[model samples]
Structure formats: C-alpha cells, structure tokens
Target: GSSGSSGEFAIDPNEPTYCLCNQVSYGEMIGCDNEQCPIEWFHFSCVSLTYKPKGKWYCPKCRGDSGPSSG
Candidate 1:
C-alpha cells in the first residue's frame, strides 16, 4: 500500500527499530546511520534518489514536485 498520509510509518524515536527495506531486525543505531549506510533501509516513500543536504529519508523511487516526467 502507498504510505499513509498521517505519517503512521514515520520513524519514532521511542519505537523499536526495523529495517524498512529488508525487514531485518535493527536498533536505533541502524536508523541513525540510514543516510551513510550501504543499504538504505529507512526512508520516506518519496525523494529517495535525489540527494538532500540534511540527509532526509526517502524511498528508492520517489519523484517529488520536480522529478522525471510521468509519461
């Protein structure tokens, strides 16, 4: 299913850790290194490919407002 609008899947500091991509068990450290980690496991379902100076999380295939043409 598409990501919920309420950000329900959004990461919470107090919640347990789990790899968003592989579903592997992890900890806070895993999420902490999400940007630099070889395997991207935690990110929003948009803006994954594009680089962000702040290292924001995004899925591998999310084209935000200014992305490739849909057609």
Candidate 2:
C-alpha cells in the first residue's frame, strides 16, 4: 500500500468529567471519605476548601445524611 495519508485524527473524541461541577480536572481535587458517595471526587474550589480537611472528609450530602443513629 503506497498511498500516503498526511493527516491524522484522534480515534476517541469523548472526554471523562468529574467533581460536582461535572467538568474536567484542571487543578487540585479531593476525594470523599464516605465509601458510598456517588460523586466520590470534588474540586477544592467547588467545595470551598483551599486545603485538605483536618480529618475524615465527607461530601456535603453524606455529611448531613450519613451518621450514627444516636443523637
């Protein structure tokens, strides 16, 4: 096959999205401690956390929903 093809194309055009913003990662991101958190990863800016949390970090949803039954 001597035919020449000067140009090339990407086989896959689809991109994966992450975080609450549902956008691609352009910077630092954090992960949720809750084992069952759907959106397990989050952006620092999105969560308003400049630095990592002190201890176990549960995403907003799980923070309110998942907890010990006792008050």
Candidate 3:
C-alpha cells in the first residue's frame, strides 16, 4: 500500500508562517483568505495580518465586540 495520508498532509517542517510570536512554521495557522475557500493565497492586508492568529481569530469589528479579554 502507498504511504499516503487521509485528510492529513506532511510538510518539510522548516517552512514558516506570518505569525510574529512564533511563526517559524507553516500549515498550522488561521489568516485572511483572498476568497471563501482555502485555495488561493491567504493575505493579511484586507485580512488583517500576515501571520496566523494564536487562537480563535477575530476580525476588527468582531474583536471590538464583547469577546474574551486578551492576556
């Protein structure tokens, strides 16, 4: 059988993301997407940032709402 993954993918591990805290890696992140689906390149301008959010990502408006207080 082929060494393939189901609903999971492997990476080189050296790739980094847009996060500033510790974005020295990719695959694990959540940013603004150019489109609806996760196909095109996800930008951070119209999105907000180029890095992945630490936890639950909240937009500017939503962030201003009664959200969890950041530590």
Candidate 4:
C-alpha cells in the first residue's frame, strides 16, 4: 500500500534530485521535452540558458534533432 502523510515530521532528504548538478530545487529551471529523460528538470545555470527556449528543448545528454527528421 502507498504510504500516507500521517504523522510526518519532515520531508525525506534522501529522495532523488533532478537536473545536471543534482542539487535541491531552486532558481530558474526548465524541463526537457523528451519523456525518457531520467533527470527531467534542468537548471538554467547548468545549461547556460537564460531565456526560455522558444522551440523544443532537450538536455545535453539527449542531444538530437528537436523536430521531425529530414522530409
């Protein structure tokens, strides 16, 4: 059965963290468009991107065509 929030004192710190730096959540972050990305949320600082991406965005590891292949 799934664990309930009853009598919880503090949040679990050991839980996994997302992004390339693998640190706690903060700052401007973006999620990869790819569904298979193990680390979905990415830090703007880590990816060196200031403004939000206008088109499809993929993490560095999942580099490839962001759109349909050559027609």
Query: Per-residue lDDT tens digits of candidate 3, residues 1-62?
Result: 34665853343358743343323333334443333433333345445565666665544443
Top candidate on TM-score is 4
lDDT of 2: 0.71
Clashes of 1: 0
C-alpha lDDT of candidate 3 relative to the true structure: 0.44
Ranking by TM-score: 4, 2, 3, 1
Query: Model 4 compared with the native: what TM-score?
Result: 0.63
Please, what is the whole-model Cα lDDT of each candidate in the order they appear?
Answer: 0.41, 0.71, 0.44, 0.76
For all predicted structures, in order, the TM-scores are 0.19, 0.61, 0.25, 0.63
Which ranges of candidate 2 are over 4 A from the true structure?
1-13, 66-71
TM-score for predicted model 1 compared with the true structure: 0.19
Model 1: clashing residue pairs?
Answer: none
The local lDDT score (0 to 100) that residue 44 gets in candidate 3 is 54
Off-target runs (Cα >4 Å) in candidate 1 are 1-21, 27-53, 64-71
Which one wins by TM-score: 2 or 3? 2
Candidate 1 per-residue lDDT over residues 1-70, each given as its tens digit: 5444663535565655544443323332213333554455543333233333366544443323366577
Off by over 4 Å in 3: 1-43, 66-71
lDDT of 4: 0.76
In model 1, how large is the Cα lDDT of residue 17?
Answer: 50
